[PDB]
């Protein structure tokens, strides 16, 4: 033994599980608006002899030797973070530690809250993610919610917009000292000036959690949440196209000097971030993600990324008219980001039901909540977007084919309810039917043909 | 740009980095105990389009489609976990998913504990791990201390061995809703039934961090925890040589009877666990590195492995003799495991001092505390590891010239100690004198030509 062998020589049983995964994801449709094909050299760094190399503390600042590389390589990504959204190192740090989305935010509230201080993020049915908060009427649901006091703050639910005058008024009166300022399912961009505003009214922290729409700040497709936020945080995932990692970006410097004498009250972020991802949460940095991340932001750096970005809105926005041009109507009216919630209710049908019926024909989108609703088995919408297919070199006419594609499948999915009473006998029915199978059957082959013929990024064969 | 160039070509910056560490890596005699070398089958699995795929939740009980290979792997590795420590899958079962050593701790204490309940583990300069708790006398420095309440368990620094009959009399007053049995630097080997004994007079769970020696573990050449605890927790590389993950280990299945009826008390941490690493904690799995995990977790159920970890055993006792024949003093006298503990204060230099020089000479190791050091800037001791090099195919004889190597670096850092005066004008003189840098340059290119002629575990260039 060497371990120098090959997967596919050494451990045949998992190259073929790869293989298999790695066809799925080429013959198949990706809607997940979550989801990205992260490039080949991306994840040559991913897979890299980085691995290998223990490196508690920070460049220049470690417990024990070995770290002349990997010194480099992390202060490369964090000026590589910080040019991907136009930052001056003066006024902006940023830590690149840590693991994925969810433990960026987690070392925030650390470094910034006592446990039990007051945290406010958007409601999780109405298109919030998890970690900014979650209590069911019985159950402290995200450990935000354990370790802190969180109290959502909720969606219009005519406009389908975030409610910024009911926020300024639940939050004048709960008292956060945090408000977290981002989303995993909501179409339009965020007001960060006004955040910022009910932020400095009730003297919170104003926390933008921009892990959907990281890309499409660093493209400048979008507005910057920078120009008002204190603290950012981010998967390098998702529209950015990296490897599964984090980042969390401060406010570094003087930050203004109007009461104590003139002594420019300097921002204190950067310690506290700093340490709170380490040594209070995490273990040894992962090398090879951090090199992964530096590769995937210098690519998001260049003209050919903001051309991608800007191609994604072009999709999700002739997703929307595509589906706008069918009847469908789109909560908030539309979308203005990567992209689309669909109100399936109108047409009578719901967001679980579409889904079980795309996914048999290699069609992945996830079933949503919109606003009203009901049932959270039955949830009124599909959440849809564009980042991975434009990946793929997919264009407007290509998406308005997916749009087709789609709608034969909620034609079949609206078909199919009909013959069936609950959840349960429209799944079965789905599989069962031998009508509703080789109707299901054929769907999948032009789905499957006409996705195959695309690119794909990364590895040819897994 | 189709995200198909490879590394090489489109970031070239990157790549050079890449090469300088694998160069390091393969001229450096590698001593940190926490350092693995991974195998390239792991590390394609690592890098692999398994990246892209976002699979929230647990196989079969996912939140959304796509899901059917992904879900085969996580079971997968599942299994392979379980097999490679030997577990009955009807009393134990596996959590594949946490990010790493330190993410599987906190979703242990946050599956099993309140906010504020009581933890004790092994004092940090004894030779604990931060995630265990540690707080300073003014500062609660691991997020373990803030969320939870800790309080250490001490060594006897008569033996350098874990003081039971200590912890037993302290748990007592103490009341820990929790007890950790695992170490960062102990190179003795762990009385876990004394531990369950304690655990279970004061009715707490017993926690096994088994991150040090898992890969021993797995190959029985010591004894098993899984024997005596009632979780488990490791990290996936360290003596495993996988890639960077995690796991929780816990009993399932019938905990006892009721002294009255049958009733049958079942064991509680299944849910609680798989709840609290998702939805509570973390986001989506990372599974290319579940994958790599499943890649590892397969070659540790080898005979390849058992040899391997028999040689592991057989080289850190040949380093300890060879240190104790050369003179030098080793914490608890000598080792059972992967490491050992050297206390460099009777001859007469810290292990700062040392494990500058040595790093200078291309020996990387860790300065650490031994008992009685007053002095964090200058502990006394120097910790030492294995399973780097033997994984490299060094053999007794190989460590016992690597116990030359590093007696001659001593012998230098002496030298250096008796012409300067603080710490920073030692580290100073080896740049900065002539004939100081000579010997160094000397010592490091015998140090690289000895260990550039070994196997190094991974792919060729990077």
Known sequence: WTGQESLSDSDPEMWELLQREKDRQCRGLELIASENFCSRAALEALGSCLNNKYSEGYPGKRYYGGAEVVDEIELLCQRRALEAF?????????????????????????????????????????????????????????????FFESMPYKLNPKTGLIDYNQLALTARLFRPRLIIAGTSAYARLIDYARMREVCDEVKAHLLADMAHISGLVAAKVIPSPFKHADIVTTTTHKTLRGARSGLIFYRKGVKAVDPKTGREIPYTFEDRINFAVFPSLQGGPHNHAIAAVA???KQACTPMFREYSLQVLKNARAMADALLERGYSLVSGGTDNHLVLVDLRPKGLDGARAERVLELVSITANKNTCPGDRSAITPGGLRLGAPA????????????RVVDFIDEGVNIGLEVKSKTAKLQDFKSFLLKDSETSQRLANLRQRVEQFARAFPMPGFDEH
Chains 1, 2 share one sequence.
């Open 389 to 400: 297919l434009t990946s793929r070199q997919f264009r407007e006419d290509d998406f308005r």
């Open 295 to 297: 590769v995937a932001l």
């Open 86 to 146: 136009d930052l001056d190192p003066a006024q902006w740090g940023v830590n690149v530690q840590p693991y994925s989305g969810s433990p960026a935010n987690l070392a925030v509230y650390t470094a910034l809250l006592q446990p039990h201080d007051r945290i406010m993020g958007l409601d999780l049915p109405d298109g919030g993610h998890l970690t900014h908060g979650y209590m069911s009427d019985v159950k402290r649901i995200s450990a935000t919610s354990i």
